Amino acid sequence: MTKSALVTGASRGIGRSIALQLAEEGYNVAVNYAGSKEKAEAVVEEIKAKGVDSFAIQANVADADEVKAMIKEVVSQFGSLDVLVNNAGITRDNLLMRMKEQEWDDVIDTNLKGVFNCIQKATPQMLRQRSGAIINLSSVVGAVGNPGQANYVATKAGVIGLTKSAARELASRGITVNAVAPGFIVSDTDALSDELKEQMLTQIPLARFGQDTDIANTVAFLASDKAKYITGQTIHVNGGMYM
Amino acid sequence: MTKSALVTGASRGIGRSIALQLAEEGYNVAVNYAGSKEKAEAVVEEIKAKGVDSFAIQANVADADEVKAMIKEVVSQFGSLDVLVNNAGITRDNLLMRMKEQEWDDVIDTNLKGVFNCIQKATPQMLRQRSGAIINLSSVVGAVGNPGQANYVATKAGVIGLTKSAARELASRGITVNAVAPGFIVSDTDALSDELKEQMLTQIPLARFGQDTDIANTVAFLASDKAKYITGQTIHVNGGMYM
Amino acid sequence: TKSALVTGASRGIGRSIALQLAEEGYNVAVNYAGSKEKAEAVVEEIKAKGVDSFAIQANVADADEVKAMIKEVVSQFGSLDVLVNNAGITRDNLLMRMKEQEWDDVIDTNLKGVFNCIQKATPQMLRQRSGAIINLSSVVGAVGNPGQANYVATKAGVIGLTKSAARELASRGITVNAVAPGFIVSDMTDELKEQMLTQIPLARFGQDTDIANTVAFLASDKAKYITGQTIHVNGGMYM
Amino acid sequence: TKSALVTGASRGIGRSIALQLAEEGYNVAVNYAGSKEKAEAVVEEIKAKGVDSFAIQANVADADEVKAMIKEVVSQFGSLDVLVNNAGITRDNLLMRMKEQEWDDVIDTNLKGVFNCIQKATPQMLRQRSGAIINLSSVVGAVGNPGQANYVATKAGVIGLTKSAARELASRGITVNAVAPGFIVSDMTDELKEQMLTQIPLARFGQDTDIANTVAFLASDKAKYITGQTIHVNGGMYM
Ligand SMILES: NC(=O)C1=CN([C@@H]2O[C@H](COP(=O)(O)OP(=O)(O)OC[C@H]3O[C@@H](n4cnc5c(N)ncnc54)[C@H](OP(=O)(O)O)[C@@H]3O)[C@@H](O)[C@H]2O)C=CC1
Numbered sequence: 018m019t020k021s022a023l024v025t026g027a028s029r030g031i032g033r034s035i036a037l038q039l040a041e042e043g044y045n046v047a048v049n050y051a052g053s054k055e056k057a058e059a060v061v062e063e064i065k066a067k068g069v070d071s072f073a074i075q076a077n078v079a080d081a082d083e084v085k086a087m088i089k090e091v092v093s094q095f096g097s098l099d100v101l102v103n104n105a106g107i108t109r110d111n112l113l114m115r116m117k118e119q120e121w122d123d124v125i126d127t128n129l130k131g132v133f134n135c136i137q138k139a140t141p142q143m144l145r146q147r148s149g150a151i152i153n154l155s156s157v158v159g160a161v162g163n164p165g166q167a168n169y170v171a172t173k174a175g176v177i178g179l180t181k182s183a184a185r186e187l188a189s190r191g192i193t194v195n196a197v198a199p200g201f202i203v204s205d206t207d208a209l210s211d212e213l214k215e216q217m218l219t220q221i222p223l224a225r226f227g228q229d230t231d232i233a234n235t236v237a238f239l240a241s242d243k244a245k246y247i248t249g250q251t252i253h254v255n256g257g258m259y260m
Numbered sequence: 261m262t263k264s265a266l267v268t269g270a271s272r273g274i275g276r277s278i279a280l281q282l283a284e285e286g287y288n289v290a291v292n293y294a295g296s297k298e299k300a301e302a303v304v305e306e307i308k309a310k311g312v313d314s315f316a317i318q319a320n321v322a323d324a325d326e327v328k329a330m331i332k333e334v335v336s337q338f339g340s341l342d343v344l345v346n347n348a349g350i351t352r353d354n355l356l357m358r359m360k361e362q363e364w365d366d367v368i369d370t371n372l373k374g375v376f377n378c379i380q381k382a383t384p385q386m387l388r389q390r391s392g393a394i395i396n397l398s399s400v401v402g403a404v405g406n407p408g409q410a411n412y413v414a415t416k417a418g419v420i421g422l423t424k425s426a427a428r429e430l431a432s433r434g435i436t437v438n439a440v441a442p443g444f445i446v447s448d449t450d451a452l453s454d455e456l457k458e459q460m461l462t463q464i465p466l467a468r469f470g471q472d473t474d475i476a477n478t479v480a481f482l483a484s485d486k487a488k489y490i491t492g493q494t495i496h497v498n499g500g501m502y503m
Numbered sequence: 504t505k506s507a508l509v510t511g512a513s514r515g516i517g518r519s520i521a522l523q524l525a526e527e528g529y530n531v532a533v534n535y536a537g538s539k540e541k542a543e544a545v546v547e548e549i550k551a552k553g554v555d556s557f558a559i560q561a562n563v564a565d566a567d568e569v570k571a572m573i574k575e576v577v578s579q580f581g582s583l584d585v586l587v588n589n590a591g592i593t594r595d596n597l598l599m600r601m602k603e604q605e606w607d608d609v610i611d612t613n614l615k616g617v618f619n620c621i622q623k624a625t626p627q628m629l630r631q632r633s634g635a636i637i638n639l640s641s642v643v644g645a646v647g648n649p650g651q652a653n654y655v656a657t658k659a660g661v662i663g664l665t666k667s668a669a670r671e672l673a674s675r676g677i678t679v680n681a682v683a684p685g686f687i688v689s690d691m692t693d694e695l696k697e698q699m700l701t702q703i704p705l706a707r708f709g710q711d712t713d714i715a716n717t718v719a720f721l722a723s724d725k726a727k728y729i730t731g732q733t734i735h736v737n738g739g740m741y742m
Numbered sequence: 743t744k745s746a747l748v749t750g751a752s753r754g755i756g757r758s759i760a761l762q763l764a765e766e767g768y769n770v771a772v773n774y775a776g777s778k779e780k781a782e783a784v785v786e787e788i789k790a791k792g793v794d795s796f797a798i799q800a801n802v803a804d805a806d807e808v809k810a811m812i813k814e815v816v817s818q819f820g821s822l823d824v825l826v827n828n829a830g831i832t833r834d835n836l837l838m839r840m841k842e843q844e845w846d847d848v849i850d851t852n853l854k855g856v857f858n859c860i861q862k863a864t865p866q867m868l869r870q871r872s873g874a875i876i877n878l879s880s881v882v883g884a885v886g887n888p889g890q891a892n893y894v895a896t897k898a899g900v901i902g903l904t905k906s907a908a909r910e911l912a913s914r915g916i917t918v919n920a921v922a923p924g925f926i927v928s929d930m931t932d933e934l935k936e937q938m939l940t941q942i943p944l945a946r947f948g949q950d951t952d953i954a955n956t957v958a959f960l961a962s963d964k965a966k967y968i969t970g971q972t973i974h975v976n977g978g979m980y981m
C-alpha cells in the first residue's frame with residue numbers, strides 16, 4: 018500500500034523522536050535497538066497509536082549479518098524499505114593521550130562501520146524499488162572538531178563522506194543519501210548546571226538549545242517527496258553555532 | 261490573523277513558483293516586480309485562487325528608498341512581514357577580459373546590494389514582531405565558481421556571507437536567515453540542444469534537471485515553524501552536482 | 504627579473520607582504536590611496552633589500568586609475584608576475600544603522616577593487632603565460648560577523664571571484680588563490696579583546712608576517728598546482 | 743638537529759615527502775609495511791643529502807608496533823619534530839560488492855593508523871613543546887567518490903581527526919594540518935583517464951613533489967599560525 022521506514026537506535030532520544038515523526042507523516046516504522054527491548058517496544062506502541070504499523074527489531078549495527086537479518090525482516094513484514102535513518106551512535110570520550118584502544122575501536126565500529134553496514138545491506142532492496150531516501154545522523158563536531166572526542170569526530174566527519182559517496186553511487190537509480198548535523202540538543206543538558214548551560218548558550222546565536230523534534234523535522238523533510246532533488250548534503254540544525 | 265510574505269522577483273520563474281508555494285501553505289503573498297507588471301498581476305490572481313490575499317508591488321531592489329516604500333506598503337496592507345524571500349537577480353555574462361564596467365556594477369547592484377537592501381529594510385518590522393524568516397536565493401556557482409560569470413559568482417558567494425552575518429545579528433531576536441542554492445533547474449534549458457543538455461546532465465548524479473517546485477519546497481520548509489532552529493545555512497538543491 | 508604589485512602596501516598587512524616578496528627577490532610596486540609619505544617609506548625599506556621598487560597612487564575602485572597603474576608597473580619592471588589584492592577598508596555598523604555610503608564604499612574598494620586589478624592585470628599575465636594572483640579575504644568571509652554585513656559580503660564575494668578567475672585563467676599558467684587571516688595584530692584597536700583570544704586555540708593573535716609567509720608561498724614555484732583555494736591563517740579559530 | 747618521521751615512505755608520495763624534508767635539513771625516519779628493500783633505497787637517497795636516516799618497519803594499524811617505532815625514532819634522533827601520516831591503501835568496490843575485509847582493512851590503515859601515530863607521537867611533541875603533524879587526506883574526502891565508500895570514509899575521517907587533534911594540542915605549540923592531493927601521477931594505472939584530466943582546470947596531473955612542497959611548507963616555521971586546515975592541492979578540480 019503506503020510507505021515504510023527503518024530507524025536505527027530509535028528506543029530513546031532523537032531516534033525515538035524521528036521515528037514518531039515518520040509515523041505522523043504516515044510511514045510504517047521499524048524500531049531498531051541494541052539492548053533496550055522494553056523502551057523500543059514502548060515506542061513501537063506509541064507509533065501504533067498514530068494509526069500506522071510498527072515493530073521492534075533488535076540488532077547491533079556494527080555486525081554485518083545481524084544487519085542483513087534486520088533488513089530482510091523489515092522487507093518481509095513491510096513489503097519495502099522506503100526510508101533508512103542511521104541514527105544509532107555512541108560516544109567514548111577522552112583526550113587523545115588518555116584514549117584506550119577499545120574506546121577508539123568501539124566508536125568506529127558503531128558510528129562509522131554501522132552506517133556503512135546499514136547503507137550496504139539496505140541497497141539491494143532500494144535499487145529494486147528504484148526509489149528511496151537514506152538519512153544519516155552526524156553532528157556539529159563532525160564539521161568543527163572538538164577536543165576530547167577525536168574518535169567520535171572522526172566517525173561524524175567520516176559519516177559525512179560516506180553520505181557523499183553513497184549519494185554518488187545510488188543517485189542514478191532513484192535513491193537520495195543525506196546527512197543531518199545537530200548542534201546542542203536538549204537530552205541528558207537536564208542536569209547540567211547554570212554556569213555550564215550559559216557557557217554553552219553563548220555559542221548559539223539563537224540563544225537556546227535545540228529540541229528532538231527540530232532534528233525529526235529535518236529528517237522527515239529529507240525523506241519526503243518534497244526533497245527528492247536533494248542529495249549528498251548535510252543539513253546543520255544548530256541554531257547558528259556553525260555556519 | 262494568519263501569516264504573510266514578500267517575494268522579490270516573483271513575476272516569473274523560481275520566484276513565481278516560490279510565491280505560489282507560500283500561498284499553498286497559507287501565506288498572504290506580496291509579488292514584487294521590476295517591470296513586468298502584467299505577469300506579476302497574473303501571479304497575484306493565481307495566488308488569490310488559492311484562497312489567500314495578494315497584491316503586486318513594483319520596486320527596483322537596488323534602490324534603498326523604493327525598497328523602504330515597499331516594506332512599508334506590505335506592512336500597511338498585511339499587518340506584518342513574516343517571510344522575506346530575496347529571489348530577484350540578473351546575470352550579465354562575460355569572461356573577465358570582456359566584462360564591461362556596467363556588467364559588473366549592475367549585477368552587484370541587483371544581486372548583492374539588493375539583498376542587503378531588502379534585509380535591512382525588512383528588519384525594523386521583524387525585530388518588532390520578535391519573529392521571522394528570511395530566505396536568500398544563491399546558486400551552485402556561488403560555491404564552485406564558474407568561468408564567464410565572475411560578477412554573478414561574486415554576488416552569489418557574497419549573498420551567502422550576507423546570510424551568515426544577518427543570521428548572526430538577528431538570531432537572538434527570533435529571526436532566522438538562510439540561503440538556498442539551486443544547481444541546474446529547467447527554465448529557458450527548453451531550447452537547448454541534446455548535445456548540451458547531455459553535457460549538463462553528466463554533471464548531475466541524479467541524471468535529471470531540477471524543477472521550480474524543488475526550490476519552492478525548500479524555501480517554504482525554511483520559512484516554516486518546522487525549521488526555526490536552522491540558521492545561517494545554505495541548502496543546495498542540485499541533485500548532487502555539488503556536495 | 505620577477506615582479507610583484509601589492510595593493511594597499513603602505514602599512515599593515517600589505518606592507519608586510521611587500522617586504523616578504525622583496526625578501527625573496529621580487530621587484531615590488533607599492534600601491535596606496537592617500538598615504539604617500541608612508542608608502543615611500545615602505546619603498547625605501549624594500550630598496551634596501553637589493554630589489555627595485557616605486558610608489559604608485561591609484562584608487563583600486565577606479566578602473567582607469569587601475570589600468571594606468573598596471574601599465575606603469577609593466578613600464579618600470581618589464582613584467583607582472585605577482586598581483587596581491589590587499590587593499591581593504593571597513594565601515595562597521597549594525598544592520599539597523601548601516602548607511603548607504605557605508606555599504607557602497609566598502610563594496611567598491613573591497614570587491615570592485617579586486618575585480619578591477621585582476622581584470623587589468625590579466626593581459627600581461629596571459630602574454631607571459633604565467634602568473635600568481637593572491638586575494639586577501641578574512642575569516643569573517645566564511646563564518647559571518649555581526650556589525651559587518653558590508654565587509655563580510657565583500658570578503659565572501661572575493662572568494663567567489665577567486666574561484667571564477669582561477670577557472671578562467673588556469674589553462675594559460677596562472678594561479679588565483681586567496682588568504683583569509685584571522686585575528687591579526689595590525690590595527691591595535693587595551694579593551695575586552697581577550698574574548699577574541701579565547702576563540703583562538705593557538706592562544707595568541709597572529710602576526711603580519713604570518714600572512715606574508717602564506718602569500719609568498721602561494722606566489723612561488725612551490726604552489727603552482729594550487730589554485731582556486733582559500734588558505735585560512737587563523738590559529739585554529741576556524742577549521 | 744630537526745627530525746621527521748614519514749609513514750609509508752618507501753614509494754610514491756611518502757617517498758617524495760621524505761626527500762623534501764631531507765632537502766630542507768630534517769633527519770628522516772623511513773617507515774614501511776613490507777617494502778624493506780625499496781625503503782632502504784629511499785634511506786640511501788636521503789643519506790646522500792647530508793642528513794641522517796634509517797628504515798623502520800611497523801604496521802601503522804598496530805598500536806604496539808607504532809609505539810616501538812616512535813621510541814626508536816626518539817632513540818636515534820633525540821626528538822620528533824615532524825610526523826607525516828602518509829601510509830594509505832585502497833580497496834575499491836561498488837557498495838553492492840564491497841567485502842567486509844575490504845572495509846575493515848582500509849579503516850584500519852587509513853584511519854586507525856593516523857590515530858595511532860598521532861597518539862604515540864604526542865608525548866614527545868608535548869615534551870618539546872613544538873611539533874608539526876601533517877595528515878594525507880584526498881580530494882575524494884571532500885567530494886565523495888563511487889567505488890570508494892571505505893576510502894572516502896577514512897579520508898573525510900582523517901580531516902575530522904586533524905581538527906580535533908589541532909584543537910587538543912594547539913596550546914602547547916603543536917600544529918595539526920592535512921593535505922588533500924587531487925589526481926597525482928604516482929600509481930600509473932593508458933586508459934580513459936583523460937576524462938579525469940578534463941576535471942582539472944590546470945589541465946595536467948599534479949606531481950609527487952607538488953604535495954611534498956605543501957607538506958614541507960606546513961612543517962616549517964613559516965606556517966606556525968596555520969592549524970586544523972586541509973590544504974587542497976589539485977589544480978583547481980575542487981575549490
Ligand atoms: N544528543 C545530542 O545533543 C547530539 C546527538 N548527535 C548524534 O545523533 C544521534 C542520536 O543521538 P542521541 O539521541 O543523543 O543518542 P542516545 O544515546 O540517546 O541513543 C543511543 C541509541 O543508539 C543505539 N545503539 C547504540 N549502539 C548500537 C549498536 N551497536 N547497534 C544498534 N543500536 C545501537 C541505542 O540502542 P539501545 O537503547 O538498545 O542502547 C540507542 O537507541 C547519534 O548518532 C549522536 O551521535 C549529534 C549531535 C548532538
Ligand SMILES: NC(=O)C1=CN([C@@H]2O[C@H](COP(=O)(O)OP(=O)(O)OC[C@H]3O[C@@H](n4cnc5c(N)ncnc54)[C@H](OP(=O)(O)O)[C@@H]3O)[C@@H](O)[C@H]2O)C=CC1
Nearest residue numbers: 269271273274293294295296320321348349397399442445
Ligand atoms: N534558473 C536557474 O537555473 C538558477 C537560478 N538561480 C538564481 O535564483 C534566482 C531566480 O532565478 P530565475 O528564476 O532564473 O530568474 P528570472 O530571470 O526568471 O527572473 C528575474 C526576476 O528578477 C526580478 N528583478 C530583476 N532585477 C530586479 C530589480 N532590480 N528589482 C526588482 N526585481 C528585479 C525580475 O522582475 P521583472 O519580471 O519585473 O523583470 C524577475 O521577476 C536568481 O537569484 C538566480 O540568480 C540560481 C541557480 C540556477
Ligand SMILES: NC(=O)C1=CN([C@@H]2O[C@H](COP(=O)(O)OP(=O)(O)OC[C@H]3O[C@@H](n4cnc5c(N)ncnc54)[C@H](OP(=O)(O)O)[C@@H]3O)[C@@H](O)[C@H]2O)C=CC1
Nearest residue numbers: 511512513515516535536537538562563590591639641687
Ligand atoms: N587585520 C585583520 O585582523 C584582518 C584583515 N583582513 C584583510 O587584510 C587586508 C589588509 O588589511 P590591513 O592591512 O589590516 O588594513 P589597513 O587598514 O592597515 O590598510 C588598508 C590599506 O588599503 C589601502 N586602501 C584603502 N582603500 C584603497 C583604495 N580605494 N585604493 C587603493 N588602496 C586603498 C590603504 O592605503 P592608504 O594608506 O593610502 O589609505 C592601506 O594601505 C584587507 O583586505 C583586510 O580587510 C582580513 C582579515 C583580518
Ligand SMILES: NC(=O)C1=CN([C@@H]2O[C@H](COP(=O)(O)OP(=O)(O)OC[C@H]3O[C@@H](n4cnc5c(N)ncnc54)[C@H](OP(=O)(O)O)[C@@H]3O)[C@@H](O)[C@H]2O)C=CC1
Nearest residue numbers: 750751752754755774775776777801802829830878880926
Ligand atoms: N595517488 C593519488 O592520486 C592520491 C593519494 N592520496 C593519499 O596519499 C597518500 C600516499 O598515497 P600513495 O603514495 O599514492 O600510495 P602508495 O600506494 O604509493 O603507497 C602506500 C604506502 O603506504 C605504506 N603502507 C600501506 N599500509 C601500511 C601499513 N599498514 N603500515 C605502514 N605502512 C603502510 C606502503 O608501504 P609498503 O610499500 O611497505 O607496503 C606504501 O609506502 C595516501 O594516504 C593516499 O591515500 C590522496 C589523494 C590522491
